[PDB]
Amino acid sequence: PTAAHALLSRLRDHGVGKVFGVVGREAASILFDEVEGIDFVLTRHEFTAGVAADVLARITGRPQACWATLGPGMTNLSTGIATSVLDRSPVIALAAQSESHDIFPNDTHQCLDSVAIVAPMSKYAVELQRPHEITDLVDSAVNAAMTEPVGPSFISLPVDLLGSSEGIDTPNPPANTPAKPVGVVADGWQKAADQAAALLAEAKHPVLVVGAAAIRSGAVPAIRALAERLNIPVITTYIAKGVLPVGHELNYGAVTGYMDGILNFPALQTMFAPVDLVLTVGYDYAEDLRPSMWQKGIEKKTVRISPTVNPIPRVYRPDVDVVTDVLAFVEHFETATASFGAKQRHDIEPLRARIAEFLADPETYEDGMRVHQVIDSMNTVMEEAAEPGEGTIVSDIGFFRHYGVLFARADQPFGFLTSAGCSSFGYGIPAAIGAQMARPDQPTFLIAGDGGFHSNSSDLETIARLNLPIVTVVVNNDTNGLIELYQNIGHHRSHDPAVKFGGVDFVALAEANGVDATRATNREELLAALRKGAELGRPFLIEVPVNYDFQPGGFGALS
């Protein structure tokens, strides 16, 4: 009864039921059957394992776990660890290491200085030295992972120590996992919140800009109730979509720096020009809604609310900075504004009409479909297949992703799922795996571009094996299209050797992996393929040829 047993058992104490990963020769020390109620989920690549854990942790609000072997195992995991540190999720990342007496980084076969590599991109990073201490290392890893900004904690596990029973006996202390993320709280935040209330009192057109930290705090119902009483519009980051339902009159949509260029419309101005008070609730620069994006039209006052001290005063200097738990802020603000009546909200109907126009685009194009037409089709079928307030649309990374930000249906928090902080291509499949395991009876659709999807396409077999009924739409233009855009923004022309691929038949690719698939080249075929996939009881993949036809000049907000 070894450190391997004590490790899995302590993970189970913190509520962990799955370990995502790829196991190496450390399997001599750990099988993964040692503890009832915790199972191993084998992936094709360690990135997929880390991102699956990240997303399961985001949707559940609880710590999750991923696993890799020594050396290149750990370095592959590290992109998943980077996803978690920048996207903010409490992940316990575990990696094997060389036998303790044989740790000579860059000399022993497969031996890297794992702690030194992973420490700069994690909340906590340690190597096991005495087998019985694994219990307390796991606890400290959870403690640091579950403190804002939430993130991954790493434990390196020399194979000899992982397989040792030295000092291990028969009743663990309580796990004491934080109920929700620990935050920091400045003395005098209540006063700062009252100053925010006094700004709201004077303001003609305030807005709430809501990031994911608001969701982790459990502040969604409270924020909605506050907004509905005071008639304050709710604008969001990418993953804060769905904090209000689709169709809510205060659902002013999400922001992306790409939106003016994609829509050939003054969308940022429409969204922010008349606003005189911006309250960034649970603000986090990593999400990439930046101050320059709301600095439109008239001069604005700002209120930052966050469970962290401002890490970026060079960029964001709020007029009022409220460092506290988001829910505690909202509850205090309700009391302070109880007597306040409702504002006249500003008018964004021209932007709404432009968005609706893209979604309804009836044209047929000689090349393939347009991405907005694809997402409108996905929206229609997700609305049919999901219960109200349920379902998940997942997006990999690419130019198409920002169409997702604008156009994708989200009818609950994290109803639209993508990587905002880290944005690694290939994110789509592991995110859909995590989303579907987190919401076992909800429809899970994934949209991915050809570039990113193929960077991590091999985990189609994992989807097949776990029989996760994800429907995947691959929008294919034989290009890293986002990068072709940036070539043109910077140089006013392309260079194909850096962005162009030859042909990949993703339908056939999927089928090689045991996932049924089909090609769709217009709305009618796409709606049929989506409806079939949604009802199939099995994974399904749809390849859709697309093109973009972008205006390189329309993207100045990206600087």
Catalytic residue positions, numbered: 46, 425, 450, 477, 479, 548
Q: How far apart are CA 93 and CA 54, in angstroms?
A: 10
Stretch of residues binding ligand TPP (CB under 6 A), selected from 32-40, 295-303, 406-414, 418-426:
418-426
Closer residue to a copy of itself, CB minimum distance, 186 or 353:
186
- DSSP assignment of 369-395, as one string? B-HHHHHHHHHHHHHHHSPTT--EEEE
Annotated ligand binding at 188? The verdict is: no
Burial class (CB in 10 A: 0-12, 13-18, 19+), 79: buried
171's CB contacts (< 8 A; 6+ apart) are none
Q: Which one among 26, 127, 148, 450 touches ligand TPP, defined by CB under 6 A?
A: 450
CA nearest neighbour of 453 among 398, 412, 502, 388: 398
Q: Is 543 in the site for Mg ion (CB under 5 A)?
A: no
Q: Which one among 124, 265, 400, 407 touches ligand TPP, defined by CB under 6 A?
A: 400
Please report, as residue ranges, which positions from 58 to 117 form the binding site for ligand TPP (by CB under 6 A): 69, 72-73, 76
Identify whether the C-beta of residue 34 lies closer than 8 Å to the C-beta of residue 168. no
Q: How far apart are CA 377 and CA 524, in angstroms?
A: 9
Q: Which one among 479, 507, 517, 550 touches ligand TPP, defined by CB under 6 A?
A: 479
Other Cβ atoms closer than 10 A to 107: 9
Site size for Mg ion (CB under 5 A):
6
Annotated ligand binding at 397? The verdict is: yes
Q: What angle do CA 558, 54, 461 make, to 5 degrees?
A: 100
The stretches of 239-341 forming alpha helices (DSSP H) are: 259-263, 267-272, 291-294, 326-336
CA nearest neighbour of 471 among 370, 544, 406, 414: 544
Cα dihedral 433, 434, 440, 444 in deg (nearest 10): -60
Closer residue to ligand TPP, CB minimum distance, 109 or 493:
109
Fill in the DSSP letter of residue 539.
Answer: -
Closer residue to Mg ion, CB minimum distance, 272 or 425:
425
Annotated ligand binding at 478? The verdict is: yes
Q: Which one among 270, 302, 423, 472 touches ligand TPP, defined by CB under 6 A?
A: 423
Q: Is 256 in the site for ligand TPP (CB under 6 A)?
A: no
360 binds, among Mg ion, ligand TPP, a copy of itself, none (CB under 5 to 8 A by kind): none
Annotated ligand binding at 480? The verdict is: yes
Annotated ligand binding at 401? The verdict is: yes
13 binds, among a copy of itself, Mg ion, ligand TPP, none (CB under 5 to 8 A by kind): none
Q: Which one among 135, 143, 455, 477 touches Mg ion, defined by CB under 5 A?
A: 477
Q: How far apart are CA 438 and CA 58, in angstroms?
A: 9
For residue 542, the surrounding DSSP H or E stretch is: strand 540-545
Q: Which one among 451, 469, 533, 539 touches ligand TPP, defined by CB under 6 A?
A: 451
- CB of residue 449 vs Mg ion: minimum separation in angstroms? 4
- CB of residue 419 vs ligand TPP: minimum separation in angstroms? 9
Annotated ligand binding at 417? The verdict is: no
400 binds, among a copy of itself, ligand TPP, Mg ion, none (CB under 5 to 8 A by kind): ligand TPP
Closer residue to a copy of itself, CB minimum distance, 117 or 196:
117
Token couple for 3: 């450190």
Annotated ligand binding at 258? The verdict is: yes
Annotated ligand binding at 107? The verdict is: no
Q: Is 24 in the site for ligand TPP (CB under 6 A)?
A: yes
- CB of residue 543 vs a copy of itself: minimum separation in angstroms? 10
Annotated ligand binding at 477? The verdict is: yes
Q: Which one among 233, 452, 469, 539 touches ligand TPP, defined by CB under 6 A?
A: 452
Q: Which one among 481, 485, 513, 555 touches Mg ion, defined by CB under 5 A?
A: 481
Other Cβ atoms closer than 10 A to 503: 8
- CB of residue 24 vs ligand TPP: minimum separation in angstroms? 4
Q: How far apart are CA 121 and CA 421, in angstroms?
A: 12
State the distance between the two ends of the chain, measured CA to CA, in whole angstroms. Answer: 57
Please report, as residue ranges, which positions from 437 to 476 form the binding site for Mg ion (by CB under 5 A): 449-451
- CB of residue 263 vs Mg ion: minimum separation in angstroms? 20
Q: Is 257 in the site for Mg ion (CB under 5 A)?
A: no
Q: What angle do CA 152, 154, 160 make, to 5 degrees?
A: 160
- CB of residue 369 vs ligand TPP: minimum separation in angstroms? 12
Closer residue to a copy of itself, CB minimum distance, 500 or 523:
500
For residue 97, the surrounding DSSP H or E stretch is: strand 91-97
3-state secondary structure of 416: strand
Annotated ligand binding at 451? The verdict is: yes
Site size for ligand TPP (CB under 6 A):
24
20's CB contacts (< 8 A; 6+ apart) are 41, 43, 48, 49, 50, 52, 53, 64, 65, 66, 67
Binding site per annotation, positions for thiamine diphosphate: 397-400, 423-425, 451-452, 477-482, 548
Binding site per annotation, positions: 258, 288, 397-402, 423-425, 450-452, 477-482, 548, 558
Binding site per annotation, positions for Mg(2+): 450, 477, 479
